[PDB]
């Protein structure tokens, strides 16, 4: 995580900026663990609300 | 790495043509610069010039 923010440009959504490394999966690889983690992180907001 | 270890050749040919003109390497009549859009290859060009 680089910068968490709320109400950018007055829109009614947040914005989390993610720093990622281009040399762990060189623009081409997707493993299963990573996809499941992404799913969990994308449902977390609704679940906390 | 490899592009410079190769363009030392064009450096030497643009230094003194008579040395490698008849030495055995054919005349360097044209070089191509490939990359992404806006890579700023022209900069590198200046360096050799």
């Amino acid at each position: 995580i680089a910068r968490v923010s709320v109400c950018p440009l007055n829109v009614l959504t947040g914005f989390t900026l993610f720093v990622e490394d281009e040399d762990k999966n060189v623009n081409a690889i997707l493993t299963r663990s990573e996809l499941e983690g992404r799913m969990v992180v994308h449902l977390a907001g609704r679940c906390a609300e | 790495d490899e592009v410079k270890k190769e363009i030392n050749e064009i450096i030497e040919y643009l230094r003194n043509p008579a040395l490698l003109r008849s030495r055995g390497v054919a005349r360097i009549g044209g070089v191509l610069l490939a990359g992404a859009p806006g890579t700023g290859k022209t900069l590198l060009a200046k360096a050799i010039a």
Partner: protein
């Protein structure tokens, strides 16, 4: 907008492409849809 298609290898069978470049396109397309 100045103007990919899979309808060419499905019905006309062109397949004018090495398998390696097609595989690379598939990898990058999935990763780009999912993580960008």
């Amino acid at each position: 907008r100045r103007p990919n298609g899979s309808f060419k290898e499905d019905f006309f069978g062109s397949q004018r492409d090495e398998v390696h470049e097609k595989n690379q396109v598939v990898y990058q397309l999935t990763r780009h849809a999912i993580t960008h």
